[PDB]
Amino acid sequence: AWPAQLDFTIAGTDVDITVNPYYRLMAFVKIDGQWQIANPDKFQFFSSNTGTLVMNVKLDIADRYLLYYIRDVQSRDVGFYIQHPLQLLNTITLPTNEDLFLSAPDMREWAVKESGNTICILNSPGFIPPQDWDVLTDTISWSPSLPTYVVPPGDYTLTPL
């Protein structure tokens, strides 16, 4: 569960979870047959003994296309007891008034759209970043190659390609 209000900043939001503290609960945001845990700074837990305000997530447009499947971590096996996706974090009402992060979902040439004008594709070969879009110091994405951007005015409905 998460509070009624959420912010898109460096501090991000935080959710609360009810689960036995015996587990470890890494992210494992899958994209294919592979799982690609790939969330060092996107999710972060304090202390599993208490509610610990799990999942200090830093939201961005890519989540709209990304299902997470919170999994369990053991020594021999991973995600064997509990493994379910963040179903309602799959889709969030993104406030177009406030800026947000512009990580990319996949390498397959995703095109950015502000309000239907079909802004230049994000993963287009030989890409030039717009002057307005700022790159974050630490890209918050499953792939280390993908950088992070900021998009204050609108910039929703990232079109596939």
Partner: protein, 376 residues
């Protein structure tokens, strides 16, 4: 009996040490076995050296040719065996660093050589160290993979930490493809998406970057830097290090090494250099201007295709390109070299000084292949 071969590199190493160290005899005293002999052979290696060895020897020859006599150096990540001790001359301090503890002697050296393990890709250790030229070959990609960061980020950290240093010339083994990516089968297959290598002969892999990004980082570091991409030697001048120390070459291996060098070049950087403006394309068949100011009306320049001269500018009619001209512009104090090229590649532009002294180098520049745009 103990069998081994000697070499001029061995002699150069032996010329450094003042007192010969003494091994510990434990590993030989423990032997309570019988090891039958064999007839000695000069070139024992019957399968010839491997392409990895050939590439390492290219790097070593480049280092040895770059270093002069009586110069303070410092290598980044030499290894347990200080191979650089056999490369550079025996009259120069050679203080080198590596994260893993060394295996060489301590003391008993004529010129001072110091070892130290401090993870050179970190902050707060260069302010005390001294040096003029710095070498980092076959270690930067390893460190980038170890810290699990991108090659550009690791390079930027290295350059920002070297800014504290007092060196003036810098040559490292950067990791960038300078040609169409080919994915050499069995030795190096490049990953377009994730930008990794996955050396199948060692199970290793590390990221890479591109020339414009590396040059932008170097320019942001120093404005007056003179970046230059050393070209691979088709003349086999590096073969001296192999033949003069009893190693067979196995021509297929040397061809593979030549193919593999183009993806792992080594850029030379002069912190105190001469900047020079340029145009956008520099593609063959079209005009190409170049601005280089302030060499007081003595402009003996000579850009090199690979190692041969082209446009020595003592007489433009003797150049090897389709056309080239020059002007002084006394009011501005800068030459406007405009010419048209016919072969794509990287040029040196050595820029022989306007004096009897040796030539002071300028940056390098790459020319692009012809366009495929036509209209009737």
């Amino acid at each position: 009996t103990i069998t081994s071969r000697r070499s001029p590199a061995s002699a150069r190493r032996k010329a450094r040490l003042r007192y010969l160290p003494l091994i510990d005899p434990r590993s030989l005293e423990v032997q309570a076995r019988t090891i039958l002999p064999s007839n000695p052979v000069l070139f024992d290696n019957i399968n010839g050296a491997s392409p990895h060895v050939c590439l390492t020897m290219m790097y070593n020859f480049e280092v040895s040719s770059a270093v002069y006599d009586g110069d303070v150096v410092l290598d980044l990540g030499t290894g347990p065996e200080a191979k650089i001790l056999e490369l550079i001359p025996s009259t120069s301090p050679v203080t080198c660093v590596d994260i893993r503890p060394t295996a060489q002697p301590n003391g008993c050296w004529n010129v001072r050589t110091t070892f130290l393990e401090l993870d050179y890709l970190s902050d707060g250790w260069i302010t005390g160290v001294r040096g003029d030229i710095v070498t980092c070959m076959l270690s930067l990609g390893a460190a980038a993979a170890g810290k699990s960061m991108t090659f550009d980020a690791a390079f930027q950290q290295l350059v920002r930490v070297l800014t504290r240093s007092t060196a003036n010339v810098l040559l490292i083994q950067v990791n960038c493809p300078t040609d169409v990516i080919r994915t050499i089968k069995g030795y190096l297959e490049i990953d377009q998406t994730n930008k990794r290598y996955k050396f199948p002969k060692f199970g290793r892999d590390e990221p890479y970057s591109d020339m414009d990004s590396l040059e932008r980082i170097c320019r942001a570091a120093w404005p007056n830097c003179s970046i230059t991409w050393v070209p691979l030697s088709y003349d086999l001048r590096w073969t001296k290090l192999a033949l003069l120390e009893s190693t067979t070459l196995s021509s297929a291996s040397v061809r593979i090494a030549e193919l593999m060098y183009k993806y792992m070049p080594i850029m030379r950087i002069d912190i105190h250099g001469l900047p020079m403006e340029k145009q956008g394309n520099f593609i063959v068949g079209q005009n190409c201007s170049l601005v280089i100011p302030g060499f007081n009306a003595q402009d003996v320049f000579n850009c090199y295709f690979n190692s041969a001269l082209a446009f020595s500018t003592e007489d433009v009619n003797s150049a090897m390109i389709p056309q080239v001209t020059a002007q002084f512009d006394a009011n501005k104090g800068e030459w406007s070299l405009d010419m048209v090229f016919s072969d794509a590649g990287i040029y040196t532009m050595q820029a022989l000084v306007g004096s009897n002294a040796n030539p002071v180098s300028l940056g390098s520049f790459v020319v692009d292949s012809p366009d495929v745009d036509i209209t009737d």
